[PDB]
Design a protein around this ligand. Sequence first.
Ligand SMILES: [Cl-]
Ligand SMILES: [Cl-]
Ligand SMILES: [Cl-]
Ligand SMILES: [Cl-]
Ligand SMILES: [Cl-]
Ligand SMILES: [Cl-]
Ligand SMILES: [Cl-]
Ligand SMILES: [Cl-]
Ligand SMILES: [Cl-]
Ligand SMILES: [Cl-]
Ligand SMILES: [Cl-]
Ligand SMILES: [Cl-]
Lengths: 302, 302, 302, 302, 302, 302
Amino acid sequence: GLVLFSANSNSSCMELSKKIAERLGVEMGKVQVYQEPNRETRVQIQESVRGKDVFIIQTVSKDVNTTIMELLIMVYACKTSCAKSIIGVIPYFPYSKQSIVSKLLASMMCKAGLTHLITMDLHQKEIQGFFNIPVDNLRASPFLLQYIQEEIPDYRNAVIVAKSPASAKRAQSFAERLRLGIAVIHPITVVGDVGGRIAIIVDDIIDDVDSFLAAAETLKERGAYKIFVMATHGLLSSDAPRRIEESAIDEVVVTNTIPHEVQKLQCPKIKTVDISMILSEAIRRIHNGESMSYLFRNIGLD
Amino acid sequence: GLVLFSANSNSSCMELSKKIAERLGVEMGKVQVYQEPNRETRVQIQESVRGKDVFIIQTVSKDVNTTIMELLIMVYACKTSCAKSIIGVIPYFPYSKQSIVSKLLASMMCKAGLTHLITMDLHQKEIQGFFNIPVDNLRASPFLLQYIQEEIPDYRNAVIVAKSPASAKRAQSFAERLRLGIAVIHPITVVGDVGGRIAIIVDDIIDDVDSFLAAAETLKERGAYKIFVMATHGLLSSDAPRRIEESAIDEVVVTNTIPHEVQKLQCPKIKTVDISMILSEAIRRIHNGESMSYLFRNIGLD
Amino acid sequence: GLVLFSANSNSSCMELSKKIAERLGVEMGKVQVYQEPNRETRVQIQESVRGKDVFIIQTVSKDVNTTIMELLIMVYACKTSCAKSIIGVIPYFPYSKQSIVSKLLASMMCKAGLTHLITMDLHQKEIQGFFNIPVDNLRASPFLLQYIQEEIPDYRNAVIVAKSPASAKRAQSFAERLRLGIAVIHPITVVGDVGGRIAIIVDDIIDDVDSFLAAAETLKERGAYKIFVMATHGLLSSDAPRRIEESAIDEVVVTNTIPHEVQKLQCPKIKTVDISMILSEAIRRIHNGESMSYLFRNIGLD
Amino acid sequence: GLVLFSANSNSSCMELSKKIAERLGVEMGKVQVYQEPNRETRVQIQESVRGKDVFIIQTVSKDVNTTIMELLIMVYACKTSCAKSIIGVIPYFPYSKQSIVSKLLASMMCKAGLTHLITMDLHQKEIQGFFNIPVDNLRASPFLLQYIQEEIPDYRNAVIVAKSPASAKRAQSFAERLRLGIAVIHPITVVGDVGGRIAIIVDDIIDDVDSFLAAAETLKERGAYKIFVMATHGLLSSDAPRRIEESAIDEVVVTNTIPHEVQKLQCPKIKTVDISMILSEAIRRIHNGESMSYLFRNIGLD
Amino acid sequence: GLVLFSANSNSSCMELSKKIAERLGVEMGKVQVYQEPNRETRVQIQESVRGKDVFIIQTVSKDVNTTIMELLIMVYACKTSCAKSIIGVIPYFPYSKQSIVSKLLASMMCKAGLTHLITMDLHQKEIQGFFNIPVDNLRASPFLLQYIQEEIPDYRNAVIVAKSPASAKRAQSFAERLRLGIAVIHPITVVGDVGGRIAIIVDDIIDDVDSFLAAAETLKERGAYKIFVMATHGLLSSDAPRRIEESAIDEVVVTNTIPHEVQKLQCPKIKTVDISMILSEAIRRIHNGESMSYLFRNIGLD
Amino acid sequence: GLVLFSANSNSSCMELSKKIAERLGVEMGKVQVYQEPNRETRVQIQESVRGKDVFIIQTVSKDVNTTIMELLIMVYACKTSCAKSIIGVIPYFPYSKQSIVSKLLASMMCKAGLTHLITMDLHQKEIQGFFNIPVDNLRASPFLLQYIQEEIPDYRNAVIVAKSPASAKRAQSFAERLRLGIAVIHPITVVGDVGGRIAIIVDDIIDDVDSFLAAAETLKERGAYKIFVMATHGLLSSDAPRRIEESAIDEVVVTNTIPHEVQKLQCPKIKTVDISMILSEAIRRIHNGESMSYLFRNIGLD
Ligand SMILES: [Cl-]
Ligand SMILES: [Cl-]
Ligand SMILES: [Cl-]
Ligand SMILES: [Cl-]
Ligand SMILES: [Cl-]
Ligand SMILES: [Cl-]
Ligand SMILES: [Cl-]
Ligand SMILES: [Cl-]
Ligand SMILES: [Cl-]
Ligand SMILES: [Cl-]
Ligand SMILES: [Cl-]
Ligand SMILES: [Cl-]
């Protein structure tokens, strides 16, 4: 090792990779990722990779399917050029929120020649076992939790909310470390005590904004005076940022697992939280053959 | 096809297979499954299997690891004898409630030569994708739901309870079809309205009885006048049936995915629900090349 | 068997599949292929496929990478639903005109669960061996050759031209059956006798139009009085049809392996030739377990 | 490297691993191997294994099937934690004395992620080729032969006996190096000259004691004045040690490939021979990338 | 099904296949197997194989390595042409009498696309498990045993001899069914009673004739008045038939698993025994999906 | 690393390997490659290979099929002895000039355990993708081109000829770097200007000499005054060298990818060009983990 590549083809999607590089104190590898006039992808690796430990950094662009082919093709080229290890750093694993298609995607990535994966907060964490190679499915919560603590005034007067019974688990994990109660939404009503409190809605992803909006109206109706949304992944497809701006939600806090330049502008309610540290530390450990055990002991928001 | 085998080695674990056979209107295949004096397993298939479609029926005995080897070894023998298809009918998939070991188990089953699986109510249903062959992960709820309706008096005065936030999803699925509210437990308190109601606790499995007992004491304390437990799988390890008998739980309703002869005697609070119909219908469809789509339209409790 | 699906998501790309169905005298299978708001693909198979022989028909749309995922995902769903055979009918295999990426594409298709392929006129025909399953790499020339004969006046006063030395082989195959001479182009000059003759340029594909245009100007300069282009695949990316309309080329004759609605309108010089017969016959043979040997004895332009 | 684990869950089965560690001059790795109340196994690796060369030492306990799962599960965890190499040191390979089930066992071990094996005196040595990874199938005879020489008085007045024609090969290998004659048993009679001699019966395993007892009575009847049994593996199932104590056999000499605490007490005729040296040397070579060629030049009984 | 091919390229090696065809009452398939001037092999299958059950019959010629490539190449062509099953009928499996190279050979045969094997009397029968597909490893002894009975006068005054302790097992199997004693050879002496008796030496193969000759001289010296050799496989390499003619051996009886035209002429002591019946019956069962169980109940020498 | 082996069994075929060793400045590894009297192959590796990087050098002898088995068997032994990498250096890949059999050959080589390949001038270069491991398909042209320049007087008065339209590509590649015109042959005539010029016929292989002879007679007839043939591979089967000696061809220039001792004597028109440099440099790079990028910058004829 060690070599970092980005398999992304526009500036906005290469931001994360750029931050990870600044943190490790390295240059990015040279590559060209573009598109032929027939819309086929072209990856072209502009340096020796032989014997090296290569971390390919790949975020999800607007064109997810093209994101995949850029990744697959690049991984394949690294295999052909006899890289020693080909670690996918794919913080947001696509096709993962439901024949289980996240399995199929995992295979093609393995068949292409991936030999390790690093990723954050998998929609179902059983997807780790969809691969036939080692996988790190990383936590983002410490960074969100620490945000709640430092950036939300009056948090001890909050209640952690789950958008649906499916999110109840994650709500509980937040409440526990914040010593708080939980409420869970389930058209729809509420279970729990929400009146006269800040309500912090907690999920792994926010993309389809519908049932985040319904959660906000109900929580408002039952006397919650401030509504937040914390999610790992800010997919925020199509007219999400507008529907948020107009709505009861006071703030949306997501990480930078997925680039969302435009939506930030369309909606100043969206607050991004930088995660490159969790990512650069995972890569540092994996390169040096250190344990993963901790992994948060010395890293923070800061 | 069609041939049915049991890979179980004691009468109690062959009950289900026997019921499935009575339903399809067939003889069981001849096999011997026993144990050498050194405690190695012996499977011995006493008939031609060549070209045939073979459904191996395997429930979990006290000695789960031996259950596995009996299964693996039998599947292997069917492969060697050139069976056309080897369908595992493994209603309770072991090592499935949490390196994800249910993955490893799935591989060995595939490598052994399994070519299809039929199973009920998988702890995480993403385990379907741990295999590299087709899988039916079957519902048991219609049969439990219909029990609630017919065998519980005053059910419309119930609230469906989730033992932990993790079970919140399944509680919601029950409440919905029964037009009811839900409560969820999370030592511990309660979220929801439980006073002056029947409380029906709903999970996929009951084995470790601890947090079923705590759920019952709290539900009792908050004025729930009758406590039920419905779970697909009645593993009911060790001194479960006693701890239940003594406790607040008024009734425990499980299916026969897992044989539990002794525990029924140790505890008349346990009510088993027969499931062979769901199992014989899945096998009927799969043999005839029919769709699975329905699968409950014409079957019932009855 | 037998079931036909299209994995295409717009009317223009489903034309071929529709013609193949009319020829075999069958209904198309029910499926939905669309796109979520986050631009992930959705395939949804609306009928039993179990035990059946399923031919998935897939042409290449503008968004080739999405074409791939639609295909891959559909194939995977057919595998999950226990289809007996899953034959890809992919008349134009993408990423095939140059780590050899057409290999990678072939693997993912096999890993996804393809069990046979049918395709026409592969850029390099060694790509058949990039798969680990049987493949038919079909001829289109008899249909083009028969066009030359019937639709070109004065063809015996032609010379078959190869755009580059790479196309020399295919030119020779055309000349031979038409009892004609060949010329080959190689900025650039010409080898052969082209003066006072019709010049028919012959390739497997036309997408990047550049060196077709240079071939036409030179052939014009050396006294060829009429310039044709015959190619199997009419990819015709971007501003191809315009550059053709303006140019020396008098006519472009391509098959319908690739849908090109718009380009036909942008350029009446483009003449499409229907190929569904070669495709329906290959499918007829493969379903009935007949030989492929002939395959053209009884089919024609007509 | 280098890390040693035991996948055994009781003191008696961890003895060998403990001796191997004392010989190499290392600490054992930290692990927990126990059993849940439902009798599922739990392995838990209490240290970083990443990048390391890991030798998992596994002897066969009373519950052989559980021995397997403990092994399989541990190997899998080492794979997940990205060990560089996972060498099984499995001195007694179970299910090996006869669909050939020792093949199936070998696969699951490979599929689990084993990358090398070390083992002693395989029932059929063709089992090496049941794996898809390198295997050392180690000799124990030099250590038994040297015992005969040093610990048997009057050995030159022995005849090496084969229990059945199947053991004739191994008898011959012993006679040769001891410059002696052989006899072979085949109810039953004898081939060879046994009168007025010490008779040393030589096999790879002793588990089912039946035909060792018949061999002893016949050898006694034909005037052999002292009967020994030397076998690599002392499985010694069930009421073996008693049946030996009562019988004509004067001494049974086995190695410690298989722990047999209880049987030693039940029968002082059983003499164990320590083999950890052959095992620690094989591990020393394999770690250092040295040849195996010798392997006995410098090791002995001592 | 059903189609029979021979992958042999000279008349003498196609004899067996021809007899198998006469027995089943079928024509042989059309194929061409020859050699280019550069000595590469050419197989060319002159008929549709699609959907069919194809039994490729392959004996070992003088040029064993070419025998392999002819086989491998043919199997591959049958895979490409989408045969439903490709059963190798390879009565003598080469490279089988000792890295275990018979394993490697088995893989290439599986990778090539073999899906079943039929073979007789494998040097080590554990080689069945070197494949990843079903295998029948067939007996030849009933046909040799019946020869002893009918074609040897005074057989009850024989003793079955094993050339080396390694052959002791097989000698015992012969003695048992003939109710006789055994002797075993081990330069060299004898164990057993051979004086004044016919001595029948019994092995699976005879190729290297050396230790058959030494066995004969010793057996002669100890008063055996007539020496026979029965072996399944008559490889009989190089100057074997001469060395036999000159020697003490009175008769050599082998099967026709391996063609030996020339050696019969060079040595009228060699008596071949026809085996096509065992082979045609195995093929009959396997085609019809019948059991193999018997397999000798109704077949004989005759 | 590093260890070099030859898997060839006669002096003439070990010449290349010997030159490669002299260039790297190393001893060859000890091995024995011979043939048993039954004509099976024997490879026997006479040194530790464990952990080492092993380059097996294999040229094609008269008996190509035996060349294959020698290679396969040796590769397998290196796998068994736990070599770290097993690089095939197989400058002439057999069965490569046309079910595509070069695919089958590639698999068996991979299955045997090859982990890298080095080779020169593959008949179709798509054969790289027939493997599932990295491959270097090396150029020989710089060494032939430099020969033309230095060893042919009056080369600027040449025209590069393609034997058939299939060779047109390679002719063009030669003309380009030599700034010359091309002619292409296609019984037969000529396309291009050949009168009063030296004609240099350029192919990747010369084995079947037929259409080289026809190319020479026609080129002579149309006034070409001197005929050369340059090809990478000098297979030169059977009575090639004689047919050349008698013919119009003035000179044949081939590399030493394939040993041709006898043909040089039978025909002084054949001029061999040493290529060990391209081969030793490829091996140097691959051992040191350097790029391949250049690969000719510093090497030459010299
Ligand atoms: Cl999901
Ligand atoms: Cl998280
Ligand atoms: Cl879980
Ligand atoms: Cl359920
Ligand atoms: Cl190309
Ligand atoms: Cl074509
Ligand atoms: Cl055995
Ligand atoms: Cl031993
Ligand atoms: Cl052997
Ligand atoms: Cl036999
Ligand atoms: Cl070719
Ligand atoms: Cl070249």
